[PDB]
Design a protein around this ligand. Structure first.
Ligand SMILES: O=C(O)c1ccc2cc[nH]c2c1
Ligand SMILES: [Mg+2]
Length: 704
């Protein structure tokens, strides 16, 4: 074949070439020593990797049987979980020791943006989303109602623009209050004796807290902009009477700029579809362009220059601080196969290659962490041993890369049940590497359903968000983080807002996350990060965290409360709706995944709301239907009929290729069907083995 032999490994030429010609040059790592390291690391860690996955299966089988032989005793269930080593002892209190971590992670609370690394233009916008226009975010979304008069048109609408301006003035009043009066009545800004002075019609005033004045641009006498800081986040008022908006403005203001996406996660996992060496290389190459600072379509932003209150000069980061999300322990990829032809573990490969590439970001670029850290998000881990394994992998990789030990820092996803109930030990296992924990609530619900598949029928998918287990899971995660001393040291993060068009709703409800003590939470786009930034100005996360300290708000019993439905909880019509809804979302996502290699896309649901979502929402839907089928809530004819019914709608909702009417001939349709009908047999309900196989199948058919 077209592979390169190195030890026991056979590396796809496209990857070998990528590494030698693009990734390695500029790192000072000897190419031959690198490849020897890859061979050695894969050979050494592969057995432990496999045994961990086998252990998952064995635990699940025991729980499966336990439920089959079962009016539901929690004392018994809990002592059984401890017996089989599912529930492990909680360690004594400790504080994490992770050092050399940047301020964007240790200290600054704010939005965290996640983007598919395979999409270069998306990744570019994400990195540039550290600063974003509040006016654009308000004007373009439904935050400002399109009520009579204020509708978006083909051209600028002055009625709407004025509501945007008023909305921002109120934000300023709430965030950076004047000693007296309102920003709404401002006519000018000036800096005098190093102090911000605001002109109102009748008199002048300063800030109630002059500590919020951070800097300015242009002459102090008539600044071209004024820079404020609040709860550690910057706000920049652009002052330009010459501009169109500025002309209509009372103080010549052109825009309000928010520091928005403080950090960004470049994603190789659930938001992308990458099933072979060509796909991985595309991803790795974008990740390289990001770290080298030369990725272009439009290019990456430079730092920002300001004059300090006093009159000196300083600078602020122009770009979002980058994490990379590697895949988890489950999958293999044929990017590399061994002599026997066995595919190599993809997570192992990601650590080596994304780690290698990240070195560039530590270096002056013809730039990322100034403290010398590399930030890797690791998803879908089940328990402390799997966490320890990930740390051992990073340690071995650091050795191959000639990096100081603990350079490679870990963002722990809390998105599997065996991690949730052992969270303190999982953190302890990574106490010198961990830079965040985060509630991946969607995968977590998929795992919740699969783990208790045999217990009985589960509540409807929309009911899950408010079940006792998930509310406890959220509080427990924050409690464990704070108890491990995350305050001032590491992020406590919460989940993604998936309704991309419902920004009014996001601004209304997503404030609950910072109020819950989360120093960060996930947004889908630059625009959403700007709007989500508002919440951090309203909530004092540091204070909230201090108030939460030492609280223990979720019991193990609460964590373990299985979301079983009550006897006969559903009328026939509600059942049908749940089925159609789930089939619709499965089909809408899968069709783009299998046909176009698109791992994340705005997909209208049944009620026709635009949902982003990724692989995890597929995991939830397939497991729920698999659970209902397993326990006789629905029949196989129900599933099939629903799939055939929703298919044409999906086709219609959509370079596309219709699934209907020849379903048995549609690879996408059959993948969706397989996900449901084989759902119960997928390891932890994971959708990758099926998706990957079907996408490779589609690629092979397209080729001929
Ligand atoms: O981190 C994820 O699982 C996730 C979820 C939704 C979206 C939409 C774009 N990127 C995503 C990532
Ligand atoms: Mg997830």
């Amino acid at each position: 074949t077209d592979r390169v032999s190195v030890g026991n490994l056979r590396i796809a030429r496209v990857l070998y070439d990528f590494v030698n010609n693009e990734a390695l040059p500029g790192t000072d790592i000897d190419p031959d020593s690198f490849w020897a390291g890859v061979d050695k690391v894969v050979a050494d860690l592969t057995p432990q990797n496999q045994a961990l996955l086998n252990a998952r299966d064995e635990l699940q089988a025991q729980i499966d049987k336990w439920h089959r032989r079962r009016p539901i005793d929690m004392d018994a269930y809990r002592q059984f979980l401890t017996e089989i080593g599912y529930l492990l002892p909680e360690p004594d209190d400790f504080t994490i020791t992770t050092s050399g971590v940047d301020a964007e992670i240790t200290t600054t609370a704010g939005p965290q943006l996640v983007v598919p690394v395979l999409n270069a233009r998306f990744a570019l916008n994400a990195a540039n989303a550290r600063w974003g226009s509040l006016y654009d975010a308000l004007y373009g979304t439904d935050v400002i109602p399109e009520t009579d008069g204020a509708e978006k048109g083909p051209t600028y609408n002055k009625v709407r623009g004025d509501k945007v301006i008023a909305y921002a003035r109120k934000f300023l009043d709430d965030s950076v209050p004047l000693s007296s009066g309102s920003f709404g009545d401002a006519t000018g800004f000036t800096v005098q004796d190093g102090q911000l002075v605001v002109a109102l019609p009748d008199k002048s005033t300063g800030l109630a807290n002059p500590g919020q004045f951070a800097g300015y641009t242009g002459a102090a006498e008539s600044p071209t902009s004024v820079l404020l800081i609040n709860h550690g986040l910057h706000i920049e008022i652009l002052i330009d009477p010459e501009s169109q908006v500025g002309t209509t403005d009372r103080a010549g203001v052109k825009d309000v700029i928010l520091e928005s996406a403080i950090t960004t996660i470049m994603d190789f996992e659930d938001s992308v579809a990458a099933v072979d060496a060509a796909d991985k290389v595309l991803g790795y190459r974008n990740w390289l362009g990001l770290n080298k600072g030369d990725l272009a379509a439009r290019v990456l932003n430079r730092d920002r220059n300001y004059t300090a209150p006093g009159g000196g000069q300083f600078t602020l980061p122009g770009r979002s601080l980058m994490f990379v999300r590697n895949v988890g322990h489950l999958m293999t990829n044929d990017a590399i196969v061994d002599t026997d032809g066995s595919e190599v573990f993809e997570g192992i490969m990601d650590a080596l290659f994304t780690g290698l590439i990240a070195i560039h970001g530590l270096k002056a670029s013809d730039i990322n962490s100034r403290t010398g850290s590399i930030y890797i998000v690791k998803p879908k881990m089940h328990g402390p041993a799997e966490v320890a394994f990930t740390c051992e992998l990073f340690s071995r990789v650091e050795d191959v890369l000639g990096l100081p030990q603990n350079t490679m820092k870990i963002g722990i996803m809390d998105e599997e049940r065996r991690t949730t109930v052992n969270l303190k030990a999982c953190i302890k296992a990574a106490a010198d590497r961990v830079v965040f924990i985060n509630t991946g609530f969607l995968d977590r619900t998929g795992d919740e359903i699969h783990t208790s598949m045999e217990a009985g029928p589960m509540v409807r998918k929309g009911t899950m968000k408010s079940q006792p287990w998930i509310l406890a899971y959220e509080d427990h995660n924050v409690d464990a983080g704070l108890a491990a001393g995350f305050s001032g040291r590491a992020q406590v993060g919460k989940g993604m807002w998936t309704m991309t068009e419902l920004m009014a709703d996001m601004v209304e409800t997503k404030i609950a996350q910072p109020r819950a003590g989360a120093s960060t939470a996930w947004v889908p786009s630059p625009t959403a990060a700007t709007l989500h930034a508002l919440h951090y100005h309203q909530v004092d996360v540091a204070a909230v965290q201090q108030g939460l300290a030492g609280k223990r708000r979720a019991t193990i019993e609460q964590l373990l409360t299985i979301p079983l439905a009550k006897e006969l909880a559903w009328a026939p019509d509600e059942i049908r709706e749940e089925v159609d809804n789930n089939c619709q979302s499965i089909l809408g996502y899968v069709v783009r995944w299998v046909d176009q290699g698109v791992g994340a896309s705005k997909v209208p649901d049944i009620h026709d709301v635009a949902l982003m979502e990724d692989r995890a929402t597929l995991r939830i839907s397939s497991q729920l239907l698999a659970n209902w089928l397993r326990h006789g809530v629905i029949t196989s004819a129900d599933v099939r009929a629903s799939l055939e019914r929703m298919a044409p709608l999906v086709d219609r909702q959509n370079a596309y290729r219709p699934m209907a009417p020849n379903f048995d001939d549609s690879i996408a349709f059959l993948a969706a069907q397989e996900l449901i009908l084989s759902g119960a047999q997928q390891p932890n309900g994971y959708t990758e083995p099926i998706l990957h196989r079907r996408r490779r199948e589609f690629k092979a058919r397209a080729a001929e």
